[PDB]
Amino acid sequence: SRKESYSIYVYKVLKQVHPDTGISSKAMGIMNSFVNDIFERIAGEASRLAHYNKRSTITSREIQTAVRLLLPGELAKHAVSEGTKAVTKYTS
DNA sequence: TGCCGAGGCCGCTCAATTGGTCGTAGACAGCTCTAGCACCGCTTAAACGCACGTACGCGCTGTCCCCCGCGTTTTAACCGCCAAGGGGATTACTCCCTAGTCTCCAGGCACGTGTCAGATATATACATCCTGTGCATGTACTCGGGATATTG
Protein backbone atom coordinates (compact mmCIF):
# COMPACT_ATOMS: atom_id res chain seq x y z
CA SER A 1 0.00 0.00 0.00
CA ARG A 2 1.03 3.65 -0.60
CA LYS A 3 3.06 5.49 2.10
CA GLU A 4 2.89 9.21 0.99
CA SER A 5 5.56 11.93 1.64
CA TYR A 6 6.43 15.60 0.94
CA SER A 7 9.63 14.41 -0.81
CA ILE A 8 8.65 15.75 -4.26
CA TYR A 9 7.67 19.29 -3.23
CA VAL A 10 10.99 19.90 -1.42
CA TYR A 11 12.78 18.73 -4.58
CA LYS A 12 10.56 20.93 -6.73
CA VAL A 13 11.42 23.90 -4.47
CA LEU A 14 15.13 23.10 -4.59
CA LYS A 15 15.06 23.47 -8.41
CA GLN A 16 13.35 26.86 -7.85
CA VAL A 17 16.35 28.32 -5.97
CA HIS A 18 19.48 26.32 -6.97
CA PRO A 19 18.89 24.93 -10.51
CA ASP A 20 22.17 22.96 -10.61
CA THR A 21 21.98 21.43 -7.11
CA GLY A 22 20.56 18.28 -5.47
CA ILE A 23 19.96 16.36 -2.23
CA SER A 24 21.32 13.08 -0.90
CA SER A 25 18.65 10.59 0.20
CA LYS A 26 19.73 10.80 3.90
CA ALA A 27 19.47 14.59 3.63
CA MET A 28 15.96 14.26 2.20
CA GLY A 29 14.67 12.62 5.39
CA ILE A 30 15.63 15.79 7.26
CA MET A 31 13.40 18.00 5.08
CA ASN A 32 10.64 15.35 5.07
CA SER A 33 10.70 15.56 8.92
CA PHE A 34 11.17 19.30 9.34
CA VAL A 35 8.35 20.19 6.96
CA ASN A 36 5.79 18.10 8.88
CA ASP A 37 7.03 19.27 12.32
CA ILE A 38 6.15 22.84 11.31
CA PHE A 39 2.82 21.47 9.99
CA GLU A 40 1.96 20.06 13.40
CA ARG A 41 3.01 23.15 15.36
CA ILE A 42 0.74 25.36 13.20
CA ALA A 43 -2.18 22.91 13.36
CA GLY A 44 -1.89 22.54 17.16
CA GLU A 45 -1.68 26.31 17.85
CA ALA A 46 -4.47 27.18 15.40
CA SER A 47 -6.65 24.53 17.05
CA ARG A 48 -6.10 26.05 20.53
CA LEU A 49 -6.78 29.54 19.19
CA ALA A 50 -10.21 28.49 17.90
CA HIS A 51 -10.98 26.82 21.24
CA TYR A 52 -9.98 29.81 23.43
CA ASN A 53 -12.34 32.02 21.37
CA LYS A 54 -15.07 29.30 21.24
CA ARG A 55 -15.20 29.10 17.43
CA SER A 56 -15.67 25.86 15.50
CA THR A 57 -14.03 26.73 12.16
CA ILE A 58 -10.42 27.68 11.43
CA THR A 59 -10.36 30.47 8.85
CA SER A 60 -7.26 32.17 7.48
CA ARG A 61 -7.00 34.48 10.56
CA GLU A 62 -6.98 31.46 12.91
CA ILE A 63 -3.71 30.48 11.15
CA GLN A 64 -2.16 33.88 10.48
CA THR A 65 -2.23 34.34 14.26
CA ALA A 66 -0.72 30.89 14.84
CA VAL A 67 2.18 31.82 12.47
CA ARG A 68 2.60 35.24 14.11
CA LEU A 69 2.99 33.57 17.55
CA LEU A 70 5.12 30.63 16.48
CA LEU A 71 7.80 32.22 14.18
CA PRO A 72 10.66 34.11 15.83
CA GLY A 73 11.39 37.37 14.11
CA GLU A 74 11.75 38.64 10.53
CA LEU A 75 10.40 35.17 9.57
CA ALA A 76 7.02 36.16 11.07
CA LYS A 77 6.59 39.37 9.03
CA HIS A 78 7.92 37.60 5.90
CA ALA A 79 5.71 34.48 6.21
CA VAL A 80 2.65 36.69 6.89
CA SER A 81 3.51 38.80 3.82
CA GLU A 82 3.96 35.57 1.78
CA GLY A 83 0.75 33.79 2.79
CA THR A 84 -1.33 36.95 2.12
CA LYS A 85 -0.10 36.72 -1.51
CA ALA A 86 -1.40 33.17 -1.85
CA VAL A 87 -4.94 33.62 -0.59
CA THR A 88 -5.22 37.00 -2.42
CA LYS A 89 -4.38 35.22 -5.71
CA TYR A 90 -6.58 32.21 -4.90
CA THR A 91 -9.67 34.41 -4.33
CA SER A 92 -9.42 35.63 -7.96
C1' DT B 1 98.73 46.60 24.24
C1' DG B 2 97.71 42.06 22.95
C1' DC B 3 94.51 38.05 22.21
C1' DC B 4 90.11 36.16 21.84
C1' DG B 5 85.75 35.57 23.12
C1' DA B 6 81.79 36.59 22.57
C1' DG B 7 79.07 38.34 18.76
C1' DG B 8 75.89 38.95 14.85
C1' DC B 9 74.15 37.33 9.73
C1' DC B 10 72.93 33.25 5.95
C1' DG B 11 72.38 27.62 2.99
C1' DC B 12 70.69 22.13 4.55
C1' DT B 13 66.83 18.75 6.15
C1' DC B 14 62.82 17.49 8.13
C1' DA B 15 57.60 17.89 9.02
C1' DA B 16 52.88 19.41 8.90
C1' DT B 17 49.12 21.50 5.54
C1' DT B 18 47.41 22.07 0.64
C1' DG B 19 46.28 21.50 -3.08
C1' DG B 20 46.36 18.35 -7.01
C1' DT B 21 45.27 13.90 -9.97
C1' DC B 22 43.46 8.65 -10.37
C1' DG B 23 40.16 5.48 -10.88
C1' DT B 24 35.97 3.13 -9.46
C1' DA B 25 31.38 2.21 -7.15
C1' DG B 26 27.57 2.29 -5.61
C1' DA B 27 23.52 5.97 -5.06
C1' DC B 28 21.03 9.77 -7.65
C1' DA B 29 18.44 11.57 -11.05
C1' DG B 30 15.24 10.27 -14.21
C1' DC B 31 12.02 7.20 -17.07
C1' DT B 32 8.47 5.02 -17.47
C1' DC B 33 5.64 4.17 -15.42
C1' DT B 34 -0.12 2.34 -15.49
C1' DA B 35 -1.38 2.03 -11.62
C1' DG B 36 -4.96 4.04 -8.95
C1' DC B 37 -6.75 6.43 -6.12
C1' DA B 38 -6.94 10.68 -4.61
C1' DC B 39 -8.16 15.90 -6.60
C1' DC B 40 -11.19 17.88 -8.88
C1' DG B 41 -15.80 19.51 -10.61
C1' DC B 42 -20.63 19.38 -9.65
C1' DT B 43 -24.51 19.56 -7.37
C1' DT B 44 -27.08 19.30 -2.77
C1' DA B 45 -28.72 20.70 1.64
C1' DA B 46 -27.18 21.77 4.64
C1' DA B 47 -23.87 25.33 10.07
C1' DC B 48 -21.84 28.77 11.51
C1' DG B 49 -19.65 32.96 10.63
C1' DC B 50 -20.54 37.76 10.92
C1' DA B 51 -21.94 43.27 10.77
C1' DC B 52 -24.70 45.48 13.73
C1' DG B 53 -27.80 49.69 19.36
C1' DT B 54 -27.69 49.26 23.82
C1' DA B 55 -27.27 47.95 28.96
C1' DC B 56 -23.81 49.09 31.50
C1' DG B 57 -19.06 47.32 33.74
C1' DC B 58 -15.23 48.70 34.65
C1' DG B 59 -10.77 51.15 32.71
C1' DC B 60 -9.23 55.29 33.50
C1' DT B 61 -9.22 59.73 35.96
C1' DG B 62 -8.36 64.43 39.82
C1' DT B 63 -7.44 64.79 44.41
C1' DC B 64 -4.39 64.33 48.96
C1' DC B 65 -0.69 61.49 52.11
C1' DC B 66 3.24 59.47 53.42
C1' DC B 67 7.57 55.14 53.34
C1' DC B 68 11.00 53.72 50.82
C1' DG B 69 13.76 55.68 48.06
C1' DC B 70 18.08 58.84 47.78
C1' DG B 71 22.45 60.45 49.41
C1' DT B 72 27.12 59.89 52.40
C1' DT B 73 31.13 57.88 54.01
C1' DT B 74 33.62 54.40 57.10
C1' DT B 75 35.10 50.38 57.02
C1' DA B 76 35.53 46.02 56.22
C1' DA B 77 37.04 42.12 54.49
C1' DC B 78 36.16 40.43 49.87
C1' DC B 79 38.44 39.69 46.07
C1' DG B 80 41.93 40.09 43.46
C1' DC B 81 46.85 39.06 42.87
C1' DC B 82 51.80 36.03 42.48
C1' DA B 83 54.75 32.46 43.28
C1' DA B 84 55.86 27.53 44.72
C1' DG B 85 55.06 22.55 45.03
C1' DG B 86 53.08 18.05 43.89
C1' DG B 87 51.26 15.29 41.57
C1' DG B 88 48.22 13.52 38.46
C1' DA B 89 46.84 14.48 33.88
C1' DT B 90 49.51 13.44 29.61
C1' DT B 91 52.46 11.07 25.96
C1' DA B 92 54.32 7.60 23.60
C1' DC B 93 54.95 2.89 23.20
C1' DT B 94 53.71 -2.68 22.96
C1' DC B 95 50.52 -6.27 23.70
C1' DC B 96 46.42 -7.48 23.30
C1' DC B 97 41.03 -8.31 22.62
C1' DT B 98 37.12 -7.54 20.20
C1' DA B 99 34.54 -4.54 16.77
C1' DG B 100 33.33 -5.17 12.81
C1' DT B 101 32.42 -8.01 8.14
C1' DC B 102 30.04 -11.72 5.68
C1' DT B 103 27.70 -15.53 5.46
C1' DC B 104 24.62 -19.04 6.46
C1' DC B 105 20.38 -20.05 8.47
C1' DA B 106 15.21 -20.01 10.84
C1' DG B 107 11.29 -18.96 12.44
C1' DG B 108 9.06 -14.89 15.22
C1' DC B 109 6.37 -11.83 14.53
C1' DA B 110 5.17 -7.88 12.46
C1' DC B 111 2.96 -7.76 8.64
C1' DG B 112 -1.12 -8.33 6.14
C1' DT B 113 -6.29 -9.57 5.20
C1' DG B 114 -11.46 -11.34 6.08
C1' DT B 115 -15.85 -10.59 8.93
C1' DC B 116 -18.96 -8.02 10.57
C1' DA B 117 -20.62 -6.51 16.85
C1' DG B 118 -20.43 -4.47 20.60
C1' DA B 119 -19.45 -0.74 20.54
C1' DT B 120 -20.91 4.57 20.92
C1' DA B 121 -23.44 8.11 18.49
C1' DT B 122 -27.83 10.55 18.03
C1' DA B 123 -33.11 11.91 19.75
C1' DT B 124 -36.64 12.88 22.83
C1' DA B 125 -38.39 13.38 27.43
C1' DC B 126 -36.92 15.02 31.68
C1' DA B 127 -35.72 15.54 36.56
C1' DT B 128 -32.13 16.93 38.90
C1' DC B 129 -27.88 18.85 40.03
C1' DC B 130 -25.60 22.62 39.94
C1' DT B 131 -24.94 27.80 39.70
C1' DG B 132 -25.79 32.48 41.46
C1' DT B 133 -27.54 34.61 44.94
C1' DG B 134 -28.03 36.01 49.44
C1' DC B 135 -26.33 35.73 54.25
C1' DA B 136 -23.98 34.92 60.27
C1' DT B 137 -19.28 34.29 62.73
C1' DG B 138 -15.08 33.08 63.32
C1' DT B 139 -10.61 33.54 62.42
C1' DA B 140 -6.68 35.12 61.00
C1' DC B 141 -4.96 39.61 61.40
C1' DT B 142 -2.60 43.99 63.36
C1' DC B 143 -1.13 45.94 67.55
C1' DG B 144 1.16 46.52 72.24
C1' DG B 145 3.97 44.80 76.18
C1' DG B 146 7.18 41.50 78.06
C1' DA B 147 10.40 37.18 77.77
C1' DT B 148 14.03 34.78 75.58
C1' DA B 149 18.00 34.55 72.49
C1' DT B 150 22.47 36.22 70.27
C1' DT B 151 25.34 39.30 68.68
C1' DG B 152 29.87 41.93 69.62
Curated annotation (Swiss-Prot):
PTM-bearing positions, type N6-(2-hydroxyisobutyryl)lysine: K3, K12, K15, K26, K54, K77, K85, K89
Assigned keywords, A-Z: Acetylation, ADP-ribosylation, Antibiotic, Antimicrobial, Chromosome, DNA-binding, Glycoprotein, Hydroxylation, Isopeptide bond, Methylation, Nucleosome core, Nucleus, Phosphoprotein, Ubl conjugation
Modified residues (Phosphoserine): S5
N6-crotonyllysine PTM sites in chain numbering: K3
Subcellular location field: Nucleus; Chromosome
Chain positions with N6,N6-dimethyllysine modification: K26
Covalent cross-link Glycyl lysine isopeptide (Lys-Gly) (interchain with G-Cter in ubiquitin), where: K3, K89
Modified residues (PolyADP-ribosyl glutamic acid): E4
N6-(beta-hydroxybutyryl)lysine sites (modified residues): K3, K54, K85, K89
Modified positions (N6-succinyllysine) in chain numbering: K3, K85, K89
GO MF terms held by the record: DNA binding; protein heterodimerization activity; structural constituent of chromatin
Sequence positions bearing N6-glutaryllysine: K3, K12, K15, K77, K85, K89
Residues with the N6-methylated lysine modification: K85
Keyword set includes Signal: no
Modification Phosphothreonine, positions: T84
N6-malonyllysine: residues bearing it: K85
Taxonomic superkingdom: Eukaryota
Quaternary structure and interacting proteins, as annotated: The nucleosome is a histone octamer containing two molecules each of H2A, H2B, H3 and H4 assembled in one H3-H4 heterotetramer and two H2A-H2B heterodimers. The octamer wraps approximately 147 bp of DNA.
Family: Belongs to the histone H2B family.
Protein name: Histone H2B type 2-E
Segment of the intact protein contained: 33 to 124 of 126
